[PDB]
Design an enzyme around this catalytic site. Sequence first.
Site, PDB file in Angstrom:
ATOM      1  N   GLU A  36      -8.928  -6.362  -4.866  1.00  0.00           N
ATOM      2  CA  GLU A  36      -8.540  -5.077  -3.941  1.00  0.00           C
ATOM      3  C   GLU A  36      -9.466  -4.219  -3.340  1.00  0.00           C
ATOM      4  O   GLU A  36      -9.310  -4.056  -2.306  1.00  0.00           O
ATOM      5  CB  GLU A  36      -7.479  -4.215  -4.799  1.00  0.00           C
ATOM      6  CG  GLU A  36      -6.239  -4.823  -5.014  1.00  0.00           C
ATOM      7  CD  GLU A  36      -5.193  -4.696  -4.075  1.00  0.00           C
ATOM      8  OE1 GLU A  36      -5.355  -4.096  -2.895  1.00  0.00           O
ATOM      9  OE2 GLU A  36      -4.039  -5.320  -4.460  1.00  0.00           O
ATOM     10  N   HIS A  93      -7.513  -5.906  -0.551  1.00  0.00           N
ATOM     11  CA  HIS A  93      -6.102  -5.111  -0.085  1.00  0.00           C
ATOM     12  C   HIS A  93      -5.797  -5.435   1.364  1.00  0.00           C
ATOM     13  O   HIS A  93      -6.743  -5.352   2.314  1.00  0.00           O
ATOM     14  CB  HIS A  93      -6.759  -3.609  -0.197  1.00  0.00           C
ATOM     15  CG  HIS A  93      -5.244  -2.553   0.056  1.00  0.00           C
ATOM     16  ND1 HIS A  93      -4.691  -2.598  -0.971  1.00  0.00           N
ATOM     17  CD2 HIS A  93      -5.065  -2.051   0.843  1.00  0.00           C
ATOM     18  CE1 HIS A  93      -3.770  -1.746  -0.832  1.00  0.00           C
ATOM     19  NE2 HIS A  93      -4.083  -1.082   0.450  1.00  0.00           N
ATOM     20  N   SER A 120       0.727  -1.302   0.056  1.00  0.00           N
ATOM     21  CA  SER A 120       0.113   0.040  -0.075  1.00  0.00           C
ATOM     22  C   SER A 120       0.978   1.222   0.009  1.00  0.00           C
ATOM     23  O   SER A 120       2.000   1.363  -0.887  1.00  0.00           O
ATOM     24  CB  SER A 120      -0.977  -0.180   1.044  1.00  0.00           C
ATOM     25  OG  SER A 120      -2.109   0.694   0.842  1.00  0.00           O
TER      26      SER A 120
END
Length: 559
Positions: free
Chosen positions: A340, A460, A207
């Site tokens: 995600e 994610h 990230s």
Amino acid sequence: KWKIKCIENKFLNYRLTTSETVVAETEYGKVKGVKRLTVYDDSYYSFEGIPYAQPPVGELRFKAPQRPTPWDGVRDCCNHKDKSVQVDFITGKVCGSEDCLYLSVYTNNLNPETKRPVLVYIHGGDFIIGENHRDMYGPDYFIKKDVVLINIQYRLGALGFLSLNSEDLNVPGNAGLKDQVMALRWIKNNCANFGGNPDNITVFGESAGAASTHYMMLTEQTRGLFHRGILMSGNAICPWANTQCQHRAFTLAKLAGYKGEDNDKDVLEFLIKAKPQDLIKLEEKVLTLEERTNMVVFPFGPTVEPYQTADCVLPKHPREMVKTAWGNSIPTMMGNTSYEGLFFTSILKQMPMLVKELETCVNFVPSELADAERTAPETLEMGAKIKKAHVTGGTPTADNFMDLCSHIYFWFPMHRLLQLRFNHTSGTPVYLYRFDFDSEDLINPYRIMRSGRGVKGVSHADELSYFFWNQLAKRMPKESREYKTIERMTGIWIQFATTGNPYSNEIEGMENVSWDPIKKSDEVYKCLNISDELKMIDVPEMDKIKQWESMFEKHRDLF
């Protein structure tokens, strides 16, 4: 009551502590670490709270980091230090400390000068949250192998990312990225004291940590400091990864009670005197309606610096920095999860009206292509291409919204980076993975954030559970699919860190894989898809990726 869970984890970590300690050298003084167990009964030496910079307090607030003061004696590194000042993602209250410029080093045995591969993890958290504490980033899985793992902290939020145009003030921005630069220099200069190879360092992050790793591959400041990079669900050309925030210092000051006018000197003087918790608590209010409509998500973050300084990290937009980046010439691995955008589940349940944004998709058009009013016929044309890629029926759905999010924030910037980077580079390989292993039996706190209990799909950050021990983790049986995925994911990352090629015939289920890196001539990307099996596949996201690219048909020089 995740508070009680934090307590139970603290007591678990006492039970995993041994009485054995060891002293290691650093360029600034000696440090004492402690041998710890894992729940799997592996063991490792743990050094936490190693400073790489002076505490950035007082007149050092907002400024590039300064080297730390050396010490005689032995600094105690048998416990962690505070995280950077931030709003606790669970409690909503400010926590942490300005005194946060530390890193942690972990290795199963302390063998100075023996050249073990070094892996350096930069955490994510949108440049506003995160830490190197072992309640989220326990090294327990990596230390099964003879590596040196290092987890860094860096300044977050307005304290890390204030930026002022006035050259005389020397607050150009990116203090938190300059912290990362200092930490990487420390690692090159000190890892051998911990048995790590200064000629074989791998930087990885997820990230905002992936954007960070990419920034550390782009900037001249770090040229040659490391030898492999892994970008997990992000990079420096993602739209969430940089912003022009020079005008927002005045807004923050005003929210915090400032009584003066918009000039950088007076604004800085107020901000230097303010209590740090007051500034950090108010950061969520800084963005304007117009900025939020244009999908600026965070008020302070990495920025193009307004003037040149000795420590400057980002002298131009990251897209331009790719064209001359030293890191284009090191082995690189990139990847994303298979769903995600499931990250946005809870946001969509709270504000169901967000689905209406899909009627025209104008707010999702890349800012470089859109008008500020988002009303231009050309902007509507481009929104219509996004809508075609993601809206499956008539009325758009929440699942369409989450699918779009996977692309705007992860897959499309990946594609743009690959295509830009090919036009440079010395030919060094880039390998793609797709994390597609779904389990609710081994989880991490990000699943709480997205209201992900009982939710299927690989969101994610779900892969972090297979790399790091965390306070929500549990011991898994050796024969379980989750245990096997820990071994596969850490094993592939260690193999890549060692050799620059992620393939190993010693990883279970990888023996019959031919994992080639992406070539310039490839029209369809191939990736290693990691599920219960390991299989090379065409990236399933490819067709939607190409639809996003079509938005640039009339602006190819901007792609």
